[PDB]
Amino acid sequence: AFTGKYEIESEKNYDEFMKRLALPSDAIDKARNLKIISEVKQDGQNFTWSQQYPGGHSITNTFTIGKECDIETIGGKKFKATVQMEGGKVVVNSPNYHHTAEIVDGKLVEVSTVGGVSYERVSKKLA
């Protein structure tokens, strides 16, 4: 809380979210019932998040709270995003995209929200 190596507790909306993001087939297949691992090194107000992915890909992200950050690659755009703490939860916010990151039970709860879909995640800290 916030820092740690978290494993996925569960997910329930990923496949349809990927189509709204415009991610490829070689991402929608290779998440099909993996134990994804959320790594979270906090630097202070800065963060070094990762969603590691035992299927031959992975997604790191360094960011800062109370700022915009630049974001590339994930479906072939070059976005900026506002990056923030909502009340107790961390959050990324950008055009056609909200993504909170709340704590409960010592675990992370994420909720992503895109054009016409949401995608919650529950990621347990247990290492």
Ligand SMILES: C[C@H](CCC(=O)NCC(=O)O)[C@H]1CC[C@H]2[C@@H]3[C@H](O)C[C@@H]4C[C@H](O)CC[C@]4(C)[C@H]3C[C@H](O)[C@]12C
């Ligand atoms: C900014 C882009 C989305 C931009 C976009 O394509 N919007 C239009 C659209 O959806 O059509 C999002 C999509 C997936 C996000 C990542 C995933 O949710 C996983 C992970 C979640 C963490 O809370 C913050 C870091 C990050 C790597 C996230 C960084 C960033 O928040 C990403 C890379």
